[model samples]
Target chain A: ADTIVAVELDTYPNTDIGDPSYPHIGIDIKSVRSKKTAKWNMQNGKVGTAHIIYNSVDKRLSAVVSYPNADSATVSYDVDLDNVLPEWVRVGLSASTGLYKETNTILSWSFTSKLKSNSETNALHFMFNQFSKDQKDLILQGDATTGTDGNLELTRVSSNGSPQGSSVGRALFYAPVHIWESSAVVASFEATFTFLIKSPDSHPADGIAFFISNIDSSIPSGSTGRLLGLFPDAN
Target chain B: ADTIVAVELDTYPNTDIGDPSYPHIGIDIKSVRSKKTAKWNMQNGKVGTAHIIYNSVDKRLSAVVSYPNADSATVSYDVDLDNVLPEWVRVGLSASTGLYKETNTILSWSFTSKLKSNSETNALHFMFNQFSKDQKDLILQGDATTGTDGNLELTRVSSNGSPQGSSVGRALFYAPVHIWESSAVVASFEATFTFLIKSPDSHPADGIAFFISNIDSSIPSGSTGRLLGLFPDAN
Candidate 1:
């Protein structure tokens, strides 16, 4: 027998993270059912797990999804510094391959934030691509910009594409920015972001990556085909 | 033994939908102790004897979740439409319920449409609220011209504040303006939308709604509390 805790939440009539009252951020599925198989299928078909945490004091948020094991794997968590953080949140798997497939590998949490800047536009943007030291080339078809030789580069793609980046890359900018003016500190910060990634035929590697920046600058690039110039290719 | 097909696709990496591809949409379960139990969970939790279909064509897409059973116990199904629709597709759910939570008063396949609208923006928005006469309302929370109503109106919150109002008060809207441009169309229609409802309170009625629209005019108002505005009454 396995001990699992599963909770399903319902958020009706809105889909904005900037709103404080109805914060539909994410879910943590960790429960034990009969020895049966369950599956999740979507139309666009891009699949991956994410971890988001919010800090209330600084209105800072940290979120990341780490795929450590290639198969039957373990994924480390990531965070976003701009959103509020939770007190103690950990998602675990009780049955099998929880981190990647069947076990409890997905964790989603939401909160409200009171921290804000005087800027009218703030954005949460991410980049995707892989840079393998062995095969040093920009892997996919998108905006691959190299700066100062190779140490930094940027890759941009449309979130609507089938494999996401073959056509004109989309630069997500000028999104709604919020700043908590009263609390002297941020209060609640919670939201959810979903996108699909179809591993290219050339790589055959199935994974997705997310990046964050504060300077409102364009995404940096990497010499080794890394999408947003943030991570080094997997060793 | 039950026969079922499932796909968890990663579309971005694998763009070619017409040919056999890797990073295909697939479902990986952790364990399968037996066939019957697996099928039971699949039907209930994952995939069952139901036909789940989703398609995005002509710049529009539709995803529908339906069940075959009309008189089964524990009459409920959880359909998570994650990564199915691309480019801010309109999402919704439909289901049937009995007058009461008993067998004699069974809520059969009573098809009802949850809120429907376009998700043109990049932010992941969720309408976390229960759907019943009193708790149900749907509106295009976009720009308003005051006279013509720039946005679309699917359904609205009934002033009576009753369960019966919420049960049938699902926000219904016109299908893809042009049938030719509809993403997922079947039999002049494509599929039926279904969602699992929780009756935690006396009525045990709670759920979520989704919508899409081109009235990208307003900055999504902060309609909070039981105010009943274009947006949800959260903050």
Candidate 2:
């Protein structure tokens, strides 16, 4: 079976394998089963702006839907396109109507992707390097993202090596490490990771941390400013 | 087919239908395929403490693994046990060693669940209220959780109605709403949600927010100490 992925805006709910909620968005992986689905009902005849951004670094397919004056919502999924799609492929929009009906249209559209260092060809990487997965081993929060070279960018930066605005974020390993054994025995660990920071603007706060706290994964109330992303600001 | 689910700490990688990683934790559903899996290698002879907590309100099965002194990590999944299990069922643990061999043991174990108003036997609710799923409609961050009676507990509280501690949290709707139509046409919305806050400790900072900001989903820096959970503390 050929693999297909799509973002379907269902005007009508299908009682079968798809969503039972009318007018929603489904991020379909293969077959009709969605990897993710959420509500998205738009004004019947209003113009709307929709965006789908694919981060080549981390493989997160982020999509957003919205109309005028109301709140916008997002649906995202992390997928390694290299393993799923062929080297050469086509991109397009589609619509299908079953027993239910509505006039669906795409008035304006655009698509942009980034990556190239063609003094060396995009395919200059060895086959092994190209196939190597940039698997996400961490669940990032706030400003954390897989940067250009795959390192964790704890805070966003500009192209010129300056910190981009004020950012405070955190990331945790995919799974909690084994730390304590029973009430009386805890594990010993040597923690080490390579990180870099540039405060070209002579910025005051460039918080850096490698904390191992409670299993509850919530940032402290006052984790910003000089709190180092770990301390609680309240009593 | 009967429905069954499990959390397996695999010692050997199975090429047949499961984890190719020799040692990992897999959350398995009805079939051999896992809904989620992550790295989990424990020492051959060390004792480790594992915790699995099921929140009845939000249907989140949060599990953690750890040994002495090292870092602990967690693997969690949101599932409604009501639809999956028979009214009366058994709970237990199991282990299997394939071609790879290791002494797998459960040194000590216990399970505890809470709920009731004993004028109610816990069958205490009507049939209609029983099967109703309290599905998590929002993605919570930091101190946010589905609290007693399934209300949004933005900041945790104590039995004596005292504020548990300092809390700063955020929650987002499942999907983006249609707020704008093109550059010139935006939509109008009436935002309303039921929320209650008790500052019995008479604490200074009990931040509450209902914001519609950028789609970036990251909380701002300096969001505590009278920042109202939205202000940036830096230049």
Candidate 3:
């Protein structure tokens, strides 16, 4: 049996420590059976909001951190845990501002335990107006932006209005692994997503692709146009 | 033990035969085990496109037929197979122009066989830019219309448009037969879909509902306004 846990940190600010290396913030997950731990870190002094979603079904842990005034863009990550779990799990957070002290405020945090069905009859369905904290964490990598109205704008074809960069977003699921075994006769999967491509201009260049891949959270670089971010030619 | 199948007909034209009754188009499915067959019919038709999707996991079949310059609006249907199957199945199609000399051209068609997983770990997801051929077939019955661009325009608050009729579209999935039988839980299910409503005028009359019913593609006639097509004036 596996349990799902979700945590939200509204604000965690680091103090201006004399030593720049003194301030740090991170989230850690410890495996109950293997006694192994995995950590996600954000170093240097900064104030940010963090959301974490852990799914025991596929042993996937995801985090999304957004900075209000920081120079860097929002960061997201997904960690696979097939080789690291033994049923039970523990999660923790660490923050340090070295000798100089700054208030680390966790505006809001939540912990939820979800039971995973062993009967293989479980299903998950949701309708999002905007990406929720959990949906943000599940995104492996991409430039797809979420609107305040809950619309997932996958791409915007504009020179100055939208970000001029390639985007690739993924929502991972815990599919049965046996479907991929060589001995299996025929594998079947179905997904349907509604998309809208609206351009103020008459022409919309390029397009999007909906695909399923075995590649785990791997984002290729330098992909654009026909490549659709799935592949990139080495520079 | 179960197989999935999908069929598409890009264009099927019926020629005019001297006997007006000779020309027709239809699709059929036969259960290999139960020896029972289900059929869908379209009469007095010109050239049109059709899309069909069938899943054995839940024993559900859907079809969408469209005519460019025909007598009626587009049509959709969903068939429940719980009582029609014996584990295996066969599918067929028939077209003719009764005593007519028109060409029944199947410009394009496809038949695909997909396997079923016994693990009960199946998921269905999709995106509709606008409803296309396949989308039409899955709609059991409704006033829902697909634009030339593939947008599923659910309603129109205007005169001289789609009869201002009550629209109800149902997407069916095979779910567990029982959740409580003698105190034992046998099944659970969930579905999520996103929709948008835009009104050219200031007022948006009535709304929409997403629901699950055991009625099996039940459509009550003469349903309007507040009823939203779920029921009619008379029982």
Q: What is the TM-score of each candidate against the true structure?
A: 0.21, 0.27, 0.22
TM-score of chain A of each: 0.33, 0.48, 0.37
Q: What are the interface RMSDs of all the models?
A: 17.4, 23.6, 27.2
Q: Is the docking of candidate 1 incorrect, acceptable, medium or high quality?
A: incorrect
Per model, the share of native interface contacts recovered reads 0.00, 0.00, 0.00
Query: What's the lDDT for residue A213 in model 2?
Result: 34
- What are the per-residue Cα lDDT tens digits for candidate 3 across A84-199? 22112232221111122222222222333333322223233333334544454334245444443444444432434432333334233323121111011222222223333323
What lDDT tens digits, residue by residue, belong to model 2 across residues A136-192?
644556655554543445555556544554455665554343321111111122222
The whole-model lDDT of each prediction reads 0.23, 0.41, 0.30
| lDDT of model 3 at position B24 | 23
What TM-score should be assigned to candidate 1?
0.21
Q: Give the per-residue lDDT digits (tens) of candidate 1, residues A1-235.
A: 1111111111111113111233122222111111111122211233344444454343333444322332121222222222211111222111111011111111221222234333332223323232223333222223322222211122232334223322112122223324222111333333332333333233221122222222132322331121112222211
Residues B1-235 of candidate 2: C-alpha lDDT, one tens digit per residue: 1234455444444432334544455555443345676666544445566655554455655556676777665677876654455433333233221112232222333333334332321211100111112535455555555544444454544554444443445555544433222231111222222223222222223123234333444443323322223332200
Candidates 2 and 3 compared by TM-score, better number: 2
In the range B1-235, model 1's lDDT, one tens digit per residue, is 1111122111111111121222112221110111111111112122112222332222222233334553221211222232222222332221111222100011211222222334321122233222333322332222111111122112222234122221222232323222222332321123332333323234321122222222221212222111111121111
- In candidate 1, position B139 carries an lDDT of 29
Per-residue accuracy of model 3 over B1-235 as CA lDDT, tens digit each:
1222222121122111011122122222221111112222333324444554544334444445555544332222354443433332232222111111122222333334333243433233333333454543344244444443444444432343321322333233223122122222122222222333333343222333232233243443323232233322211
